[PDB]
Motif scaffolding. Sequence first.
Motif, short mmCIF file in Angstrom:
data_model
loop_
_atom_site.label_atom_id
_atom_site.label_comp_id
_atom_site.label_asym_id
_atom_site.label_seq_id
_atom_site.Cartn_x
_atom_site.Cartn_y
_atom_site.Cartn_z
N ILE A 104 0.85 -1.17 0.00
CA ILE A 104 0.00 0.00 0.00
C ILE A 104 0.89 1.23 0.00
O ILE A 104 2.02 1.22 0.49
N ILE A 105 0.39 2.28 -0.64
CA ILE A 105 1.02 3.58 -0.56
C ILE A 105 0.75 4.14 0.83
O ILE A 105 -0.41 4.27 1.24
N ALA A 106 1.82 4.45 1.57
CA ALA A 106 1.71 4.62 3.02
C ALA A 106 1.23 6.01 3.39
O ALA A 106 1.95 6.98 3.15
N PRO A 107 0.08 6.15 4.05
CA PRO A 107 -0.37 7.48 4.47
C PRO A 107 0.49 8.03 5.59
O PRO A 107 1.22 7.30 6.28
N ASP A 108 0.41 9.35 5.76
CA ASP A 108 1.04 10.00 6.90
C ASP A 108 0.40 9.52 8.20
O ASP A 108 -0.82 9.50 8.35
N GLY A 109 1.25 9.16 9.16
CA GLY A 109 0.82 8.81 10.50
C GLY A 109 0.85 7.32 10.77
O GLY A 109 1.36 6.88 11.80
N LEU A 110 0.27 6.54 9.85
CA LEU A 110 0.40 5.08 9.81
C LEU A 110 1.79 4.63 10.25
O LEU A 110 2.81 5.01 9.65
N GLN A 111 1.86 3.75 11.25
CA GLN A 111 3.14 3.17 11.60
C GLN A 111 2.94 1.69 11.83
O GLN A 111 1.82 1.17 11.85
N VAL A 112 4.07 1.01 12.02
CA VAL A 112 4.09 -0.44 11.96
C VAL A 112 3.21 -1.04 13.05
O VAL A 112 3.23 -0.60 14.21
N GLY A 113 2.45 -2.07 12.70
CA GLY A 113 1.65 -2.82 13.64
C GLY A 113 0.15 -2.62 13.56
O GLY A 113 -0.58 -3.51 13.98
N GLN A 114 -0.34 -1.50 13.04
CA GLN A 114 -1.78 -1.25 13.16
C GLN A 114 -2.60 -2.07 12.18
O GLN A 114 -2.13 -2.48 11.11
N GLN A 115 -3.84 -2.34 12.58
CA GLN A 115 -4.85 -2.91 11.70
C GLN A 115 -5.22 -1.91 10.61
O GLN A 115 -5.21 -0.70 10.83
N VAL A 116 -5.54 -2.45 9.44
CA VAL A 116 -6.02 -1.68 8.30
C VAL A 116 -7.00 -2.56 7.55
O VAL A 116 -6.88 -3.79 7.58
N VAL A 117 -7.97 -1.96 6.87
CA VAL A 117 -9.05 -2.72 6.25
C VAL A 117 -9.75 -1.82 5.24
O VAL A 117 -9.76 -0.60 5.37
N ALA A 118 -10.34 -2.45 4.23
CA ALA A 118 -11.04 -1.76 3.16
C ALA A 118 -12.46 -2.31 3.05
O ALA A 118 -12.68 -3.51 3.23
N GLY A 119 -13.42 -1.43 2.78
CA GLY A 119 -14.79 -1.85 2.58
C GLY A 119 -15.78 -0.84 3.10
O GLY A 119 -15.44 0.04 3.90
#
Lengths: 272, 48
Positions: A104-119
């Motif tokens: 994924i193209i990494a957004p600002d703030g996002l850092q390693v470990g967090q959950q992410v999801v689409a829908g």
Amino acid sequence: AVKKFKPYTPSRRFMTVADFSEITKTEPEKSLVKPLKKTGGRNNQGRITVRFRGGGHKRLYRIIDFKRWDKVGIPAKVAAIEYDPNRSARIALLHYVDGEKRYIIAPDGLQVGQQVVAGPDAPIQVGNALPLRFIPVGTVVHAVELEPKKGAKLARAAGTSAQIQGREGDYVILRLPSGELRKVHGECYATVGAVGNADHKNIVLGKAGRSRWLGRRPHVRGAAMNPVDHPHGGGEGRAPRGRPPASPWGWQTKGLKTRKRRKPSSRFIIAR
Amino acid sequence: MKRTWQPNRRKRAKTHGFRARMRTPGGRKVLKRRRQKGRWRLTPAVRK
RNA sequence: AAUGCGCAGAUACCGGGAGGAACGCCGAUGGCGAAGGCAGCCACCUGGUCCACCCGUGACGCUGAGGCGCGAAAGCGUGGGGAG
RNA sequence: GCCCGGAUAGCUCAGUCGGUAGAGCAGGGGAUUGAAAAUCCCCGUGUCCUUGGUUCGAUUCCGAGUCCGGGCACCA
RNA sequence: GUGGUUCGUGGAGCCAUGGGGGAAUCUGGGCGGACCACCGCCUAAGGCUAAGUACUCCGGGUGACCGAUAGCGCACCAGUA
RNA sequence: GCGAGCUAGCCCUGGCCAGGGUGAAGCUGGGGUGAGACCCAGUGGAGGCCCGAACCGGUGGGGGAUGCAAACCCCUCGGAU
RNA sequence: UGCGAAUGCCGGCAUGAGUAACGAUAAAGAGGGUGAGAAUCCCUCUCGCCGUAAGCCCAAGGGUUCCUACGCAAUGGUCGUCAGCGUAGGGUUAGGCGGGACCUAAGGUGAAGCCGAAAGGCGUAGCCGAAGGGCAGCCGGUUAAUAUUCCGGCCCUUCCCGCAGGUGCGAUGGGGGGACGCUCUAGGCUAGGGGGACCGGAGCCAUGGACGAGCCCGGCCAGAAGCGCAGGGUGGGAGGUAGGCAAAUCCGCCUCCCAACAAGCUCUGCGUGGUGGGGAAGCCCGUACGGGUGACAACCCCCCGAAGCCAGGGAGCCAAGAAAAGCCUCUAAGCACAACCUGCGGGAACCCGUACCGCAAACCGACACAGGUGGGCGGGUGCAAGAGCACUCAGGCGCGCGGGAGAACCCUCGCCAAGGAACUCUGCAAGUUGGCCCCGUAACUUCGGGAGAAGGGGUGCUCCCUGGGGUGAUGAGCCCCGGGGAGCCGCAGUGAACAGGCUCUGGCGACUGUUUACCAAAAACACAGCUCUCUGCGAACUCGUAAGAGGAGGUAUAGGGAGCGACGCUUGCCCGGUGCCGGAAGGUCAAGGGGAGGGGUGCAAGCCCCGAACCGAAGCCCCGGUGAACGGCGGCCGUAACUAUAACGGUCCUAAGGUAGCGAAAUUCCUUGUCGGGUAAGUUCCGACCUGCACGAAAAGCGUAACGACCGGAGCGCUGUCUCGGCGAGGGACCCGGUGAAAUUGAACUGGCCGUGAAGAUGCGGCCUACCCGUGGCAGGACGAAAAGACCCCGUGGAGCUUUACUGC
RNA sequence: CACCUCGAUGUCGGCUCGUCGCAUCCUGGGGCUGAAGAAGGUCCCAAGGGUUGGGCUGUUCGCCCAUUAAAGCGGCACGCG
Ligand SMILES: [K+]
Ligand SMILES: [K+]
Ligand SMILES: [K+]
Ligand SMILES: [K+]
Ligand SMILES: [K+]
Ligand SMILES: [K+]
Ligand SMILES: [K+]
Ligand SMILES: [K+]
Ligand SMILES: [K+]
Ligand SMILES: [K+]
Ligand SMILES: [K+]
Ligand SMILES: [K+]
Ligand SMILES: [K+]
Ligand SMILES: [K+]
Ligand SMILES: [K+]
Ligand SMILES: [K+]
Ligand SMILES: [K+]
Ligand SMILES: [K+]
Ligand SMILES: [K+]
Ligand SMILES: [K+]
Ligand SMILES: [K+]
Ligand SMILES: [K+]
Ligand SMILES: [K+]
Ligand SMILES: [K+]
Ligand SMILES: [K+]
Ligand SMILES: [K+]
Ligand SMILES: [K+]
Ligand SMILES: [K+]
Ligand SMILES: [K+]
Ligand SMILES: [K+]
Ligand SMILES: [K+]
Ligand SMILES: [K+]
Ligand SMILES: [K+]
Ligand SMILES: [K+]
Ligand SMILES: [K+]
Ligand SMILES: [K+]
Ligand SMILES: [K+]
Ligand SMILES: [K+]
Ligand SMILES: [K+]
Ligand SMILES: [K+]
Ligand SMILES: [K+]
Ligand SMILES: [K+]
Ligand SMILES: [K+]
Ligand SMILES: [K+]
Ligand SMILES: [K+]
Ligand SMILES: [K+]
Ligand SMILES: [Mg+2]
Ligand SMILES: [Mg+2]
Ligand SMILES: [Mg+2]
Ligand SMILES: [Mg+2]
Ligand SMILES: [Mg+2]
Ligand SMILES: [Mg+2]
Ligand SMILES: [Mg+2]
Ligand SMILES: [Mg+2]
Ligand SMILES: [Mg+2]
Ligand SMILES: [Mg+2]
Ligand SMILES: [Mg+2]
Ligand SMILES: [Mg+2]
Ligand SMILES: [Mg+2]
Ligand SMILES: [Mg+2]
Ligand SMILES: [Mg+2]
Ligand SMILES: [Mg+2]
Ligand SMILES: [Mg+2]
Ligand SMILES: [Mg+2]
Ligand SMILES: [Mg+2]
Ligand SMILES: [Mg+2]
Ligand SMILES: [Mg+2]
Ligand SMILES: [Mg+2]
Ligand SMILES: [Mg+2]
Ligand SMILES: [Mg+2]
Ligand SMILES: [Mg+2]
Ligand SMILES: [Mg+2]
Ligand SMILES: [Mg+2]
Ligand SMILES: [Mg+2]
Ligand SMILES: [Mg+2]
Ligand SMILES: [Mg+2]
Ligand SMILES: [Mg+2]
Ligand SMILES: [Mg+2]
Ligand SMILES: [Mg+2]
Ligand SMILES: [Mg+2]
Ligand SMILES: [Mg+2]
Ligand SMILES: [Mg+2]
Ligand SMILES: [Mg+2]
Ligand SMILES: [Mg+2]
Ligand SMILES: [Mg+2]
Ligand SMILES: [Mg+2]
Ligand SMILES: [Mg+2]
Ligand SMILES: [Mg+2]
Ligand SMILES: [Mg+2]
Ligand SMILES: [Mg+2]
Ligand SMILES: [Mg+2]
Ligand SMILES: [Mg+2]
Ligand SMILES: [Mg+2]
Ligand SMILES: [Mg+2]
Ligand SMILES: [Mg+2]
Ligand SMILES: [Mg+2]
Ligand SMILES: [Mg+2]
Ligand SMILES: [Mg+2]
Ligand SMILES: [Mg+2]
Ligand SMILES: [Mg+2]
Ligand SMILES: [Mg+2]
Ligand SMILES: [Mg+2]
Ligand SMILES: [Mg+2]
Ligand SMILES: [Mg+2]
Ligand SMILES: [Mg+2]
Ligand SMILES: [Mg+2]
Ligand SMILES: [Mg+2]
Ligand SMILES: [Mg+2]
Ligand SMILES: [Mg+2]
Ligand SMILES: [Mg+2]
Ligand SMILES: [Mg+2]
Ligand SMILES: [Mg+2]
Ligand SMILES: [Mg+2]
Ligand SMILES: [Mg+2]
Ligand SMILES: [Mg+2]
Ligand SMILES: [Mg+2]
Ligand SMILES: [Mg+2]
Ligand SMILES: [Mg+2]
Ligand SMILES: [Mg+2]
Ligand SMILES: [Mg+2]
Ligand SMILES: [Mg+2]
Ligand SMILES: [Mg+2]
Ligand SMILES: [Mg+2]
Ligand SMILES: [Mg+2]
Ligand SMILES: [Mg+2]
Ligand SMILES: [Mg+2]
Ligand SMILES: [Mg+2]
Ligand SMILES: [Mg+2]
Ligand SMILES: [Mg+2]
Ligand SMILES: [Mg+2]
Ligand SMILES: [Mg+2]
Ligand SMILES: [Mg+2]
Ligand SMILES: [Mg+2]
Ligand SMILES: [Mg+2]
Ligand SMILES: [Mg+2]
Ligand SMILES: [Mg+2]
Ligand SMILES: [Mg+2]
Ligand SMILES: [Mg+2]
Ligand SMILES: [Mg+2]
Ligand SMILES: [Mg+2]
Ligand SMILES: [Mg+2]
Ligand SMILES: [Mg+2]
Ligand SMILES: [Mg+2]
Ligand SMILES: [Mg+2]
Ligand SMILES: [Mg+2]
Ligand SMILES: [Mg+2]
Ligand SMILES: [Mg+2]
Ligand SMILES: [Mg+2]
Ligand SMILES: [Mg+2]
Ligand SMILES: [Mg+2]
Ligand SMILES: [Mg+2]
Ligand SMILES: [Mg+2]
Ligand SMILES: [Mg+2]
Ligand SMILES: [Mg+2]
Ligand SMILES: [Mg+2]
Ligand SMILES: [Mg+2]
Ligand SMILES: [Mg+2]
Ligand SMILES: [Mg+2]
Ligand SMILES: [Mg+2]
Ligand SMILES: [Mg+2]
Ligand SMILES: [Mg+2]
Ligand SMILES: [Mg+2]
Ligand SMILES: [Mg+2]
Ligand SMILES: [Mg+2]
Ligand SMILES: [Mg+2]
Ligand SMILES: [Mg+2]
Ligand SMILES: [Mg+2]
Ligand SMILES: [Mg+2]
Ligand SMILES: [Mg+2]
Ligand SMILES: [Mg+2]
Ligand SMILES: [Mg+2]
Ligand SMILES: [Mg+2]
Ligand SMILES: [Mg+2]
Ligand SMILES: [Mg+2]
Ligand SMILES: [Mg+2]
Ligand SMILES: [Mg+2]
Ligand SMILES: [Mg+2]
Ligand SMILES: [Mg+2]
Ligand SMILES: [Mg+2]
Ligand SMILES: [Mg+2]
Ligand SMILES: [Mg+2]
Ligand SMILES: [Mg+2]
Ligand SMILES: [Mg+2]
Ligand SMILES: [Mg+2]
Ligand SMILES: [Mg+2]
Ligand SMILES: [Mg+2]
Ligand SMILES: [Mg+2]
Ligand SMILES: [Mg+2]
Ligand SMILES: [Mg+2]
Ligand SMILES: [Mg+2]
Ligand SMILES: [Mg+2]
């Protein structure tokens, strides 16, 4: 954050390299890299169709996911953020729970470990992709599809971001990084947040060589040529433009507007 | 200095070779003319 | 008065929207801070101060060259913003 | 050295279809002021650069000349 | 909108056709140089068809044709060196 | 029609750059402070950094000028991660 | 169908002329042999040259040039008995080396498919494509000429078929892997190298000395298993499972466990290693060269040590560093009396290349051409190092004309009394300086620089003392980095060679870079950076008729176009004209629509022509905006209480009348402006003034540290650059022997002066000089040679370029 | 002016090398003088020989500096590539 140098050589005075702190992984996801054919600006005839292009470091294409709906409601953990030599942005490597790994193209703030999801479900949180119609008004958002299922094509350069301004039937009103206001269909996906690596705009290449490493060959002014080559070529010494400033192909290059007026998309635009 | 003839046996047959001629209608006509004139060799003499 | 704006449909009026700045009444000759200064409202983090009580330490005080910190407006740099 | 333009009230200048030519400022006379200005009322002198010529008549049309201004003096 | 014809837009028809519109089956259609009337000639939008005609890599026969700087570039192991 | 076996650009894949100097950041230690900034050392080994062969050049001068050479030779000079 | 001319064409033969040359100034000499013939061929001795090569090995290219025998007409810059030449014969051996019966890269090609009047263009898969990936051979001997190819020793690989033992086997499909940058780098090794008092070895004692641990030569190479010594790679199990486009037990993900800086499995390298080979000097052999002997050769110890190997090692950094197969695993059909795997046997293992040259006389340059040509090896000693320089090993060469001579002149080189830039456009050139160590070092600065600033001192050898390292052991030896003190010799100790002259001050350009191959390297281009502008993505733009492609597998922190060109401080006014931008009104405007009304023919029904309003886009007009868009940015008269000047005023014109800053400048005509400085003297230079012919703000303005084979001025040092020349060296020039050109050439029996002549006469007139022919020299003339003048004009010649020339696309 | 030369007569200056003219810069001879002397002034004869080194500028020229008996002018394709 951005690195400066002491002037222990000329062009090190002003040289500036990015801050690689947010970088976690050096070598890339082997299963996610393709080779990219370097054009040197030449088309499928052997001819240059974009000038002053070539050389520059060999690069390996990171195959990256701009359609995020093909994994609806499947979450993923942010595994790494790595350098990508092919865009201004940094990419984030995520491990979906079902075992697929994507870029994924990494957004600002996002850092390693967090959950992410689409829908259409997803919580309105940085990294999550959603159809626009379910993203609350006034939310900054990036990697926006322009038509449904055709892939994200808007705001994907470093620190870019669109912002949702209002809704109209099947479309929603977007302000793009270019200040233009455009309606986009509600079913168009968009991961929320801004792009980040936001200090990209401050790196100061420093020397001519650094331009070469990005595959940018020297670029010669029309004024520097002769009339055979350029509208600005010739004269005796120096010489002002002596006519409306023009490209090598003789069209005016100050102000002259070039969008096709009759374009169907004119119906969905409202700004500048 | 470095003159204009830098021989390269692959180059020669890749460029002026029989199979080279036969692809372009321009080069098939080169053979046509060369045979009609009765050249002993239509194509440059090369050695793999 | 004129520049200016206005039948290419202005001002004045209604509705929708974008945006930035400043916070009317309260408000005071009032309050706080060492000064510069601080004014819509909510939360968090935080400084000084006053009083009550007379419990603890026991002169641990006052001042303060240099040094260090803060410092209205204007101005400068890199970016953003830009309604009045 | 070679072409183009101009010359009108004391200054800076309009102007003409060939007949008696004006503007602004300066200057003069009156007014206002304690007194100067600024303001108000009233007043041009012009031989329209020299010379020749066309005319009935020439600042006006023409040809030269003085003077000024502008552009030129290239291949060499 | 063009091509062909002697026809270069000309009074410009005829034949062809890229675009648009778009019929009729003999009381039908096309043509005789804008057009109309008369009078005539022909029968479009399917096809085949010898001969007389053209040429000379090749064979032959001739020459008020050449005769080795001529004559084909080559009379000779020349499209060769 | 023939040409990028010279030359210019780009693409793919390989290879080359003796030996010296200079000593950026970062470390680590010490000082400094409420905490810092910062300072000093040592380590470290950056740079279209420095000197200099190979290699790439071609600055000045001389020679050469029916040349050794249809662009060469000698000295000298530039670049050399 | 008659040639004298056309710088006519083809051919032949002259002239210059026995003239220039004979192709690197690395260099020769003698003796013997051979032969008709010898400077030139063979052999010996002596001498010189290369030795990060001028030696050796690959690759490309060349294509028999290789070897042998017989030849010398020609080719060979002379000669030739020799040859890379002529004739003939011989010669190149591979399961392991290179390449193909393997892989993919750019690119090419190309079922499907898309496009194009034709020819053709595109194009997912697939195929092709290599100095990349994959893959099994090392060392000696042998031949006149091949050898990792034949032979010898030892060792491998693949295919087939058998046994034996294992296991659900099994793809072109899934996964792992292959698999990757740059710089720096640890440890351990190997190549390679030096030493040895030790092991081996012919021999030698010269010329004053030496019979000595004397001199001289050599002391190794390949090697399976197994062993070590280094390193590299890798966790082991169980559950869940929706992902890896079917299925997986494999991978991924999750959760448990045990394990964890390791181990254990592997894998590579190195050492040892059965065995197998080599094995000098010297001496004698007759070889152009090899053999014999040395010999039963010895075959060891120490030290230096990679840039190479273990290797996918480690660290850091940003510009972020191929693919595919082999290989492992997994399952699908199918099959499991198959198959695969593991060993061990026997068999089977094809095509092509293999000679020789290969930094050059065999390749590219017409030549046996002083040029050009990629990879590897490239020893020793000394010099700080090193591939640098000097010498030198192995090896290879003296450059295919020579012999003399001892002029001018030329080239390359050495030295020079006194002076020291006086030379000259200019210190052009040449000199000076030069390495290492240590002392020291300014303005200014962007704090890094400037710096090698500047300027000095030291440098050899001998003896004594002496501190660290590395290796051995903490010890000796061998190396490496030093430090102290005494003293020796010369003009001189980086004793040769390689190795900055320095300062000051301007211009321009920030900088490293880039360019006119072959007269320009620069102040020109580029450049980081600044601004303007376009562009919402099937983007703008570019190529193409098109498909399509680049842009970009990018998305406004992105892409294109334009200018400006680090950085600092800044970038003023004018939108009247031109351009671009915005204007849903108006005017005009083409096709089209619309048809009032006219007209031609018809007996008419009709048919057929024109055709006014009016509705009709873009464009233009019109209204605005717009300057880091094209561009522009004034005149005259007067006035201050000495003069002078004019802060002030008047007035004409303009779209508006040039702000800061700079200014006789890369701009200043007058001009060598005027003043100051430098010099004895300064058309230059530097500072200033402003009267700026004709600066001025992104065709940017003014500055700026650092940088520059840029351009200007000054000085010190030092010189043959100069006063002003001299001497010398060698390569030529000269003479002799050999080979032997060239441009040019109407013909020649070709003097001077004064005239004349188409106006500059060997050639005409007069006069004057003058025996015939050469050789070495010089260049005043033959309006000398060379090129159908490049300037200039002409031609209703041609081309490149421009634009508000015309007309088109 | 356009006569030879455009199937080519190389163009400024410098350097080297000169040679001639004389309308003499110096030296030599002389007349006149508003010539005391010395030094000049001007004209006459006279071409034998001499006629400096530097700063500036490409310069010729010219101006300077320092000297000198003097720092002569011209011609020779503005002598001589
Ligand atoms: K440029
Ligand atoms: K130009
Ligand atoms: K204080
Ligand atoms: K504003
Ligand atoms: K006027
Ligand atoms: K008046
Ligand atoms: K017609
Ligand atoms: K018809
Ligand atoms: K007819
Ligand atoms: K007919
Ligand atoms: K037929
Ligand atoms: K003949
Ligand atoms: K012929
Ligand atoms: K370094
Ligand atoms: K002739
Ligand atoms: K002759
Ligand atoms: K011979
Ligand atoms: K020769
Ligand atoms: K290969
Ligand atoms: K497989
Ligand atoms: K072993
Ligand atoms: K061989
Ligand atoms: K040498
Ligand atoms: K002689
Ligand atoms: K001089
Ligand atoms: K040096
Ligand atoms: K300088
Ligand atoms: K500048
Ligand atoms: K340069
Ligand atoms: K350039
Ligand atoms: K792309
Ligand atoms: K304007
Ligand atoms: K305008
Ligand atoms: K306007
Ligand atoms: K109509
Ligand atoms: K000036
Ligand atoms: K100027
Ligand atoms: K002076
Ligand atoms: K002075
Ligand atoms: K330079
Ligand atoms: K001569
Ligand atoms: K004409
Ligand atoms: K001429
Ligand atoms: K004389
Ligand atoms: K003279
Ligand atoms: K010359
Ligand atoms: Mg991959
Ligand atoms: Mg140019
Ligand atoms: Mg071109
Ligand atoms: Mg043009
Ligand atoms: Mg121009
Ligand atoms: Mg030009
Ligand atoms: Mg100009
Ligand atoms: Mg835009
Ligand atoms: Mg050739
Ligand atoms: Mg044949
Ligand atoms: Mg509190
Ligand atoms: Mg108490
Ligand atoms: Mg403040
Ligand atoms: Mg402020
Ligand atoms: Mg600000
Ligand atoms: Mg400011
Ligand atoms: Mg701002
Ligand atoms: Mg007047
Ligand atoms: Mg009159
Ligand atoms: Mg026609
Ligand atoms: Mg008719
Ligand atoms: Mg006959
Ligand atoms: Mg013939
Ligand atoms: Mg013949
Ligand atoms: Mg090429
Ligand atoms: Mg090429
Ligand atoms: Mg460098
Ligand atoms: Mg260097
Ligand atoms: Mg090398
Ligand atoms: Mg080269
Ligand atoms: Mg040179
Ligand atoms: Mg060099
Ligand atoms: Mg003849
Ligand atoms: Mg003949
Ligand atoms: Mg002669
Ligand atoms: Mg001679
Ligand atoms: Mg000779
Ligand atoms: Mg020779
Ligand atoms: Mg002999
Ligand atoms: Mg001999
Ligand atoms: Mg050799
Ligand atoms: Mg050949
Ligand atoms: Mg031979
Ligand atoms: Mg023989
Ligand atoms: Mg001969
Ligand atoms: Mg031979
Ligand atoms: Mg032979
Ligand atoms: Mg087979
Ligand atoms: Mg194709
Ligand atoms: Mg294949
Ligand atoms: Mg390979
Ligand atoms: Mg051998
Ligand atoms: Mg051999
Ligand atoms: Mg061998
Ligand atoms: Mg299995
Ligand atoms: Mg070994
Ligand atoms: Mg050894
Ligand atoms: Mg050694
Ligand atoms: Mg013995
Ligand atoms: Mg003796
Ligand atoms: Mg003895
Ligand atoms: Mg003995
Ligand atoms: Mg060994
Ligand atoms: Mg596990
Ligand atoms: Mg599955
Ligand atoms: Mg291990
Ligand atoms: Mg023996
Ligand atoms: Mg690694
Ligand atoms: Mg395949
Ligand atoms: Mg076996
Ligand atoms: Mg061989
Ligand atoms: Mg050879
Ligand atoms: Mg050889
Ligand atoms: Mg060889
Ligand atoms: Mg080599
Ligand atoms: Mg050779
Ligand atoms: Mg050789
Ligand atoms: Mg030779
Ligand atoms: Mg050669
Ligand atoms: Mg050759
Ligand atoms: Mg060597
Ligand atoms: Mg050494
Ligand atoms: Mg050294
Ligand atoms: Mg050397
Ligand atoms: Mg030898
Ligand atoms: Mg040589
Ligand atoms: Mg001397
Ligand atoms: Mg001396
Ligand atoms: Mg001196
Ligand atoms: Mg001088
Ligand atoms: Mg010099
Ligand atoms: Mg020197
Ligand atoms: Mg100083
Ligand atoms: Mg410093
Ligand atoms: Mg320093
Ligand atoms: Mg000594
Ligand atoms: Mg030296
Ligand atoms: Mg240097
Ligand atoms: Mg100057
Ligand atoms: Mg530069
Ligand atoms: Mg440099
Ligand atoms: Mg050039
Ligand atoms: Mg070049
Ligand atoms: Mg040159
Ligand atoms: Mg040059
Ligand atoms: Mg595309
Ligand atoms: Mg520029
Ligand atoms: Mg109609
Ligand atoms: Mg319109
Ligand atoms: Mg307008
Ligand atoms: Mg401006
Ligand atoms: Mg300018
Ligand atoms: Mg400008
Ligand atoms: Mg500039
Ligand atoms: Mg300036
Ligand atoms: Mg400067
Ligand atoms: Mg440079
Ligand atoms: Mg001399
Ligand atoms: Mg001499
Ligand atoms: Mg001779
Ligand atoms: Mg005679
Ligand atoms: Mg005469
Ligand atoms: Mg006669
Ligand atoms: Mg006569
Ligand atoms: Mg006569
Ligand atoms: Mg005569
Ligand atoms: Mg003679
Ligand atoms: Mg003579
Ligand atoms: Mg001569
Ligand atoms: Mg001539
Ligand atoms: Mg010519
Ligand atoms: Mg001509
Ligand atoms: Mg020319
Ligand atoms: Mg013409
Ligand atoms: Mg013409
Ligand atoms: Mg004439
Ligand atoms: Mg002639
Ligand atoms: Mg004379
Ligand atoms: Mg006289
Ligand atoms: Mg004289
Ligand atoms: Mg000078
Ligand atoms: Mg003088
Ligand atoms: Mg003259
Ligand atoms: Mg004259
Ligand atoms: Mg002359």
